């Protein structure tokens, strides 16, 4: 894996903290968004939380798993880095919001029929891999870990960058794009990992994982989009619901694309929301 | 006789986000970092966070010209040392992070990951030092040296029986077991090593080395501070394993590793080394395994050592 040593000094290369960042113009800006942008806001970073909560522990199972050094190494950094983005968003809710309210926005994921829907999709390809790990087992969560980074993670930062485009949040923007940069070669890594179990587990590579990635993208993709129309539908400018679900198809293709897979939804060719290339 | 430990749950709606307990307690494992359950834990990850560091932002070439003045043995002794701490990475199993699968505090499960990550970067810094100094070809034969040594076989078969006693039987007693050996590993391990380097900077040589085993050995005392906190709050938490049995194993252990430690030191420096008087390290060795039995609220096995001979440490 000559490209394990480079991928390595670039992850240490793209160290922050959110410490760094100065949430007082922030905190100052958010009781003046509208009531859909407030709740929005909360129910997302109740959700970010919740992904990279369980992407901690994952990662770090995952990377004991892995025979390989480099591999492995590679994934303990990025276990660490899941660690600081779980961190983040407590930084973030208690400068933004009462103690009250981040205690509340904590017990989302207990007490959101919606939110629990979701995530037990992803705690089902966890935990089949955690209490059963195996090459396949552990080939099938890593397409759970795509969905979570590549697929969840990306729909989220759009909301945040369609404040920042509207001089909104300008600084949770920022902490967004920082995660966003560390995100990107999360993605790298798992897709490539992937796509060596196919080499080193050759019957693995079958028509049935190319059906199994379709179906779980597009679940994972059903999902997000109800989300998101049950979190914001119509009510937020510059992100309608029609482009966002043309985006998170979009996204799910690039995902397949990058295991090496057949797109779920080949006729989607186009990202609609172009816009987003100007915050990354 | 003592509970088997069940794994740490990475989903659990019927527990709270703070903690109930480190070993078989309920967690939900979405970690609130202001609502968790040790008023330290925040804190430590604040303070290990604002210690980060690369080896890429030290600059080995003055060590590099500078390395062919030391003495031959100084030479030896240096590759011997900076190759061992190199090469362990190969031939040690992680222990540690199989037991830190059964810590049901989310808090501390993440603590865990940032130790790992720290000591990938500790163990690619061993590397960084060694091959700014050495071509590839004798750091293979260093690794070859290590990989037959037989001194170094019988230390790993030490460390091997006392973490696979936790593998065959998980429980609360061989978890704290397990966590004693985290803190001498981290704690004493080496530390004549360490020392090694230091003795070499004071006298102006090797600095930029010595300054990286300095920010390797300042990273081990937070490690330390957290597995010494854990061994407390385990005793809290399972009141039965406060016994005379628990203070005799802690004493008995870190008299073992004390020699140990003294063995490797005379294997590898002994008398040879300008700066280095063997009486004064040994007795720095004893002083060191008297600091973790404080840290770990035990009595000092060399209550007779109260003081450090090697003022310049
Ligand atoms: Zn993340
Ligand atoms: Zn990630």
């Keep these: 894996f000559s ?3 480079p991928l390595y000094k670039n992850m240490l290369a793209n160290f922050w903290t959110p410490f760094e960042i100065n949430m007082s113009h922030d905190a100052k800006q958010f009781p003046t968004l509208t009531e859909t942008e407030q709740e929005a806001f909360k129910k997302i970073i109740g959700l970010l939380a919740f992904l990279d909560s369980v992407q901690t522990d994952y990662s770090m199972r995952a990377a004991e798993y892995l025979t390989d050094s480099s591999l492995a190494a590679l994934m303990s950094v990025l276990s660490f880095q ?8 407590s930084y ?10 981040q205690d509340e926005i904590f017990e989302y994921w207990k007490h959101d029929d919606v939110l629990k829907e979701r995530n037990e999709f992803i705690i089902d390809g966890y935990e089949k891999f955690v209490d059963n790990p195996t090459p396949k087992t552990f080939l099938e969560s890593i397409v759970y870990d795509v969905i979570l980074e590549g697929l969840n993670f990306y729909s989220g930062f759009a909301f945040f960058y369609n404040l920042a485009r509207n001089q909104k949040m ?4 920022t902490m967004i794009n920082y995660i966003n940069r560390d995100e990107q070669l999360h993605v790298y890594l798992f897709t490539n990992i992937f796509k060596e179990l196919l080499v080193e587990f050759p019957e693995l590579n079958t028509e049935e994982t190319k059906t199994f990635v379709k179906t779980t993208l597009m679940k994972a993709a059903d999902l997000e989009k109800d989300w998101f129309r049950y979190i914001i539908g119509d009510k937020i400018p510059g992100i309608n619901p029609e482009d966002m679900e043309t985006y998170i198809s979009f996204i799910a293709n690039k995902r397949a694309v990058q295991l090496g897979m057949e797109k779920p939804y080949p006729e989607i060719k ?3 929301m172009k816009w987003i290339r100007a915050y990354e």
């Excluded at 899941?82 to 968003?89: G, T």
């Excluded at 973030?92 to 309210?101: C, D, G, M, R, W």
């Excluded at 300008?170 to 923007?173: D, K, R």
Aim: glycine share 0%; aromatic share 10%.
């Design 3 to 5: 490209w394990a040593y």
């Design 270 to 272: 186009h990202n609609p």
């Design 82 to 89: 899941e660690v600081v983005h779980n961190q983040s968003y």
């Design 170 to 173: 300008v600084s949770t923007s």
């Design 92 to 101: 973030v809710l208690s400068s933004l919001v009462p103690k009250a309210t």
